[PDB]
């Protein structure tokens, strides 16, 4: 069930890295069947792949 | 019988440190949580939770502030098991400090 390809393939879409994406262990019968970029960009507007909270750097102290 | 009784035991995962590296505290916890469950409930094969692991790894390896409040819920196990069906399930909750608390019997209400 190696899905390192699908994650790396997401970096060749726009510019999203391989640690900002968010999948789901629930729908494991959908990701395994769709082992390509054919059903990735459509799994965003429906509510499947997000980013949410990300640790960043502020300059408010500056 | 299966009993199935939800209880809240007193156990802190921050002070129990003696001659153990601070990067290998987790293997000690394996022989601690399963031991704490065997001492009270009485089981070996204990399945935890994704949110359960976050309770230990709060803000660092020793992110545990003071005295926490864990809630072990003994349930039944099927799906053709090999060990005891009466496993343990710790339910982490929000708690600042445990003062004057020893145990809480949680029913169905």
């Amino acid at each position: 069930a190696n899905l390192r390809t699908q994650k790396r393939l997401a970096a060749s879409v726009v510019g999203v890295g391989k640690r900002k994406v968010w999948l789901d262990p629930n729908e494991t019968s959908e990701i395994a069947q769709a082992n390509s970029r054919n059903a990735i960009r459509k799994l965003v507007k429906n509510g499947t792949i997000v980013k949410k909270a990300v640790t960043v750097h502020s300059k408010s102290r500056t | 019988l299966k009993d199935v009784v939800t209880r809240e035991y007193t156990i802190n995962l921050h002070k129990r440190l003696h001659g153990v590296s601070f990067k290998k505290r987790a293997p000690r916890a394996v022989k601690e949580i399963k031991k704490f469950a065997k001492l009270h409930m009485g089981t070996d094969d204990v399945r935890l939770a994704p949110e359960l692991n976050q309770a230990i790894w709060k803000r660092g390896v020793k992110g545990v502030e003071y005295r926490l409040r864990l809630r072990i819920s003994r349930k039944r196990n099927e799906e053709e098991d090999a060990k005891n069906p009466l496993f343990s399930y710790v339910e982490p909750v929000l708690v600042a400090s445990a003062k004057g608390l020893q145990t809480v019997v949680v029913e169905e209400d």
């Binding site: 395994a32 069947q33 390509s36 054919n38 | -």
Partner: protein, 373 residues
Amino acid sequence: KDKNILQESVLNKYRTAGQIAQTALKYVTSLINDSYHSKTTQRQLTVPELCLLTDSFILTRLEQYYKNKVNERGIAIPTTIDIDQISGGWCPEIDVTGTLRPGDLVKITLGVHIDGYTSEVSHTMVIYPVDETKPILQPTGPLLGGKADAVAAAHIAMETVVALSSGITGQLIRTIVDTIARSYNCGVVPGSRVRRIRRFLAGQNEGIVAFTNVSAIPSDDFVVQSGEVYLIDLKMASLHKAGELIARPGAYVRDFAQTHILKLKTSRQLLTKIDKQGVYPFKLSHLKSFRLGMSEISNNYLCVESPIQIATSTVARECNTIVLCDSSVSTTDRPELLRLTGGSKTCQPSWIHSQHELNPQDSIVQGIFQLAT
């Protein structure tokens, strides 16, 4: 399970589908004529034109019934025209055609479905020249020889099967067919299967087999019960070991059971399109992109092919759909079968002349004559 296991409405749906199947098949038979004859009319008949016509006809008629009804109707099996040797499933793509030639033996097989209920029919006949040039030359003359022998044998088989209903075993049908076929000296094509139709399901595991010792063991004996539907198929050969010489499939069905994630976009799109279809069996003729898409799907087994098989010099077929049920009259309940196919299936017995006939006199044959009569 299925509540409302049987419904009056269900019966109606089959009957209506059957009526259309019957009409369409009659229409095609009328159309079938020699190429030269068709030329006089300023028309052309080939394996493709009839197929196209018949499929269109089924769509149109279905459209009339339950049209726009919260469901689906249409073509259960695409129209297929075999020829003398060719056993079945010949529905050519536009890209080799087959021109009808006087004296050819033709088998037309088609199916219609209303809301998933399927009515399938088949028929065999010989081709004759235009009436106008020939005036009742063909009616005066009968068909004789092997053609007559096979056709009669197939028909009789069909008649035997109709008789042979709840409380009977599939095996009895198989045995009878062998006896009847042998009477001419014909043989039923090995390992063919009849199905026990359900809604949205042409295939049915329960089946009656035409079978070598080998398939006898894998075949499953079964007893027919009330409220069961069958599509009895009878294929007979003057020669009965069919083979896939080399012909392009053309007929395919989607297999619900298997699922695969197909790599190509074209294939994915094809898969989606096919799912939309309504009947399991569609023809490719429904062109370009399809060829590519079919390849991947078939490989995966998403689609199941209906191959065309052949017997050179030497096949006749009759297929009808029957509904079996329990009727109660005179305080007695007995199974009775109703034949949906109708006129389409029928053939004129007078046309065929055969040297041989079933002969009840010998110990082997006796009883068949009575069964037929």
